Each structure stands twice: as C-alpha cells, then as structure tokens.
C-alpha cells in the first residue's frame, strides 16, 4: 500500500461489463460515475492503482477519508472520479507462518497529497533527540508489515484493492468502451457520440482549418462546435437540431374552436395551410 503500484491504460477499448458483473469483488464503489455506464464512455487515460490492505482499512480508501492508510500510504482527492474495487485475497496473500511481504507506512511528518506515493525508508524522528539512521528512543522505522495469516478475522485478512481513475480532459480520448461505431449521417438531427463525447445535433461538412493536433472546437460557450471524426480525419460542424416555442393563435372560445399553431423560429420543414414567416 505504501508503494502502491500504478499502471496506465490508454489507446485501447475495455469492456467493463465483465468487470462490475463479476461477483468476486467484495466492495465496488464508483465516485463520479456508475459501473454500468463505463461501456458508454471514453476517457483520455486511466490509472490503475493496485495494492493490498486489511478489511478494516477498506473504508479508508475513499474520498474525504482519514487514517493511517489515507494519511501516510495513499490519499484520494476530494474531487476524485473513478471506481474502487476491493476483493479478499486471503487464499493468495496469507502465509501459515506469516506473510510479511506486504507492508504499509505507519509514520509520516504530514499526510499524503492525492495520488502521492512515498517510498522513502528514512527513520522517522518522533522525539527530541534526532535519529541518525538508527532506531531507539522515539526513532522508528516508517514501514510496518501485515500479519496476513489465514486465522485472522475478516477485518484483518488481506484485501486486494484497485482504484481505476479515469481522466476526463480536453485532450483526445484514448480509452473507450465496447459498442460498435455506426456510419456517419449528415444534414439530419441525430444523437452523435464522438470518442465518448455525446450530444445531439445536426452534423455538416465544415471548412474549418483544424490543426493536426486539434480534434474539436468550442464556441464562446465552451460547447462542442466542431469535431474530428475519429475514423475519418474530417471536421464536422455540429449545430442545434430544432427547437421553438409552440403557441396557439386562437380566437375566443366563445367565438370559434378552430385555432392555428405557431412554431417559433423553425423552418417549415421540421414539422393544410403552412406559412413560413420570420
């Protein structure tokens, strides 16, 4: 845990259906996201932080948590976005004589920042007299080992914890889920999903001179105005499909029951007598 391993996942597609559908995970909590929706999203990158703790410490692995693990071994940001999956590994990480291979930090001058790893093995001074690399009075080794033997309670048994943190940046998405990509449709209202970025609009050919490193553009509203088709490197402008207030021009009900309908600000094609006014 103090030396929690980190892996990077990028430029690939992952089927999370098998992930949250597995019953082998004791704890499965997603913050900022749901297990099901992963297959319908794309992310620039993912970081998998893998480590081992005891059952009681499982709760500590969560945003807004405090404790030895959270403070000294692994801290999550308050705005963390991702999923934590913890499963018992008693059959894998427990030795009959004692599995001392798993360690955790017990002392530190200050709590860890989010996604900060500290692997230093310098003696922790807890007393007036400083420690010149030698233990003794108020001079302790910063790391301690788990027992991890099969005869423990569930709270003390080993659990393998993996945190998948998905980076949702403006850089191009590189991690997507399953789901095939349908053919491109233009000049029609459609629910588009470009690289996990979803929306609704009308897609048209664009003359904008996108730079090679530029995938999509945003307007003053920071809203997706143009995109680059991930399959075909072409620029497509997205425009709002069609919306407008429906009002009713009606003479007094006492007079007549026939009325006309006014669709404000819509062409007379997206909808007897039809009259196109400004």
């Amino acid at each position: 845990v103090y030396a929690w391993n980190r892996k990077r996942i990028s430029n690939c597609v992952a089927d999370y259906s098998v992930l949250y559908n597995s019953a082998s995970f004791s704890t499965f909590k997603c913050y900022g996201v749901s297990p099901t929706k992963l297959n319908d999203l794309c992310f620039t990158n993912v970081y998998a932080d893998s480590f081992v703790i005891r059952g009681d410490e499982v709760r500590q692995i969560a945003p807004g948590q405090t404790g030895n693990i959270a403070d000294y071994n692994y801290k999550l940001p308050d705005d963390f976005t991702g999923c934590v999956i913890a499963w018992n590994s008693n059959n894998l990480d427990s030795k009959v004589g004692g599995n001392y291979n798993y360690l955790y930090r017990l002392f530190r001058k200050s709590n860890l920042k989010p996604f900060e790893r500290d692997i230093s093995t310098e003696i922790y001074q807890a007393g007036s007299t400083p420690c010149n690399g030698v233990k003794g009075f108020n001079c302790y080794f910063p790391l301690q080992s788990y027992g991890f033997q099969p005869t423990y309670g569930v709270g003390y048994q080993p659990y393998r914890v993996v945190v998948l943190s998905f980076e949702l940046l403006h850089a191009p998405a590189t991690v997507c889920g399953p789901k095939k990509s349908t053919n491109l449709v233009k000049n029609k209202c459609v629910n588009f999903n470009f690289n996990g970025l979803t929306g609704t609009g009308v897609l048209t050919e664009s003359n904008k001179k996108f730079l090679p490193f530029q995938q999509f553009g945003r307007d003053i509203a920071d809203t997706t105005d143009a995109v680059r088709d991930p399959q075909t490197l072409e620029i497509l402008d997205i425009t709002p499909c069609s919306f407008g207030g429906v009002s009713v021009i009606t003479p007094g009900t006492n007079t007549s029951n026939q009325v006309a309908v006014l669709y404000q600000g819509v062409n007379c094609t997206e909808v007897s007598n039809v009259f196109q006014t400004r």
Partner: antibody, heavy 122, light 108 residues
Framework: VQLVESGPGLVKPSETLSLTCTVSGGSISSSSHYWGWIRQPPGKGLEWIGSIYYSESAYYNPSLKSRVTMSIDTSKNQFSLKLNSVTAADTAVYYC???????????????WGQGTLVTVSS | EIVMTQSPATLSLSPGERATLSCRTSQSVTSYLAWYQQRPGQAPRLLIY???DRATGIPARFSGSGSGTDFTLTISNLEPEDFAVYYCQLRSNWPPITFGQGTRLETK
C-alpha cells in the same frame, strides 16, 4: 477442550522421535486456530517447537527446523510431530497446545495438553 | 535479535501481598505479550494475552501493565496456590514465539 499426547516414551540417540496429539473438544479443520507443540526439559523453561495449520503448512523453530517436521490429519482429528536425529538434549516433556493468532503479534496458547515425557537415552 | 529477559529469577513474597514480575524485550519492536502460569507437574496455564487480557477463568487479582518494550505482570492478593513459575511469551518476526526465562514465585 482437551488435547492428549501419544508416542513412545523412549527414543534412542540419532533416531527420529515421533509424537501424535489427539484433540477432542472441537475441530482441527477450524480456520481460526493453530495447533502447536511446546517442549521443556526437566527443570528448564518452555520451548515452542512448531505450529501447524489445518491445510498443510506449518512453521517451526529457527534452530530445530532442519530436523523437525509436522503433519496433520483432519479425518482422525489429530496432528503429529517428527524430530529427526534426536540427541540427548531432547529429553523433555512435550505438550501439544491450541494457538489463536488474531492480529499480528497476538499468539497465545489457549488450552494446553498435559504432555508426555520423552527421555532420549541409550 | 529480539531477546526476552524476565525479572526476577526468584520472587519471595507471602500470601496477602502483591507481586510484580517484569518482562522486558530487547531494544526493539513493541506490541503484545502473554503471561502463563505453571505449577510443578502441570502444563503451563494461560493467564494473560494481548498484553493485558485475563484468560478464561483468571481471577481479578491478576493484571498486566501492557506498555512499551517492558511489560509487567501484577498479582494483587497473593493466594496460597498462586506461587508457581511464570513465563512471558512474545511472537516477533524472527524468532517467532519467544519464551521468557521464567520467574519462580515462592512463599517467604
């Protein structure tokens, strides 16, 4: 619970000393307890030899590990000890005890057996 | 190595007094300790675990000062049948399960 020791009370030097502890107050297949052996020579202190878990594995003393082995039998609900190349310093009373190791360093022998005296001489 | 040292080798007290046995570990780690009682011809009996927890059936007069490096077993009111040999036992990384040299408690 109770533990009862069994085995020859005499072992010639440079020969294997075999002992078998049979429990009857519980179950050895329980996943909460170890089963250990502790010996003491006459008029001397206690010496933990080795502790065995139900599955197969065990851990022994860092001095007698070369010439010591432990075995278990859930069917007969009993665990045995072999001490190879027994010298004259193994003349002692051997107890078999029940061990509970809950956290890390908490390792206490809950209930002891009466123990059997094995004197090794020629 | 984590070496165990009990004190004193022999303790001379009479019934009604209180006894204080010391079990100090080497200048090393600190955690739990077990105290056991052994009378002549009997297997050692568990008195205290986790550095102060009376075993099942231990009178209230037994107690443990579970503190750092050094530990202490205290017997409030010495009864006639409370004079025996007392062993303290640790479980370190290496060697595992170390036993104390034992303290002989006799009637002065």
């Amino acid at each position: 619970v109770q533990l009862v020791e069994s085995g020859p009370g005499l072992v010639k030097p440079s020969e294997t000393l075999s002992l078998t502890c049979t429990v009857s107050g519980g179950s050895i297949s329980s996943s909460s307890h170890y089963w250990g052996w502790i010996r003491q020579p006459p008029g001397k202190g206690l010496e933990w030899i080795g502790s065995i878990y139900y599955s197969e594995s065990a851990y022994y003393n860092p001095s007698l590990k070369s010439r010591v082995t432990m075995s278990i039998d859930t069917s007969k609900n009993q665990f045995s000890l072999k001490l190879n190349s027994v010298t004259a310093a193994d003349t002692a009373v051997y107890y078999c005890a029940r061990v509970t190791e809950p956290r890390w360093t908490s390792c206490y022998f809950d209930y002891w057996g009466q123990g059997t005296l094995v004197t090794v001489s020629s | 190595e984590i070496v165990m040292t009990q004190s004193p080798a022999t303790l001379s007290l009479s019934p009604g007094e209180r006894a204080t046995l010391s079990c100090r570990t080497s200048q090393s780690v600190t955690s739990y300790l077990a105290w056991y009682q052994q009378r002549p011809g009997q297997a050692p009996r568990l008195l205290i675990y986790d550095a102060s927890d009376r075993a099942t059936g231990i009178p209230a007069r037994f107690s443990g000062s579970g503190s750092g490096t050094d530990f202490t077993l205290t017997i409030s009111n010495l009864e006639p049948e409370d004079f025996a040999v007392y062993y303290c036992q640790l479980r370190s990384n290496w060697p595992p399960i170390t036993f104390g040299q034992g303290t002989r408690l006799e009637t002065k």
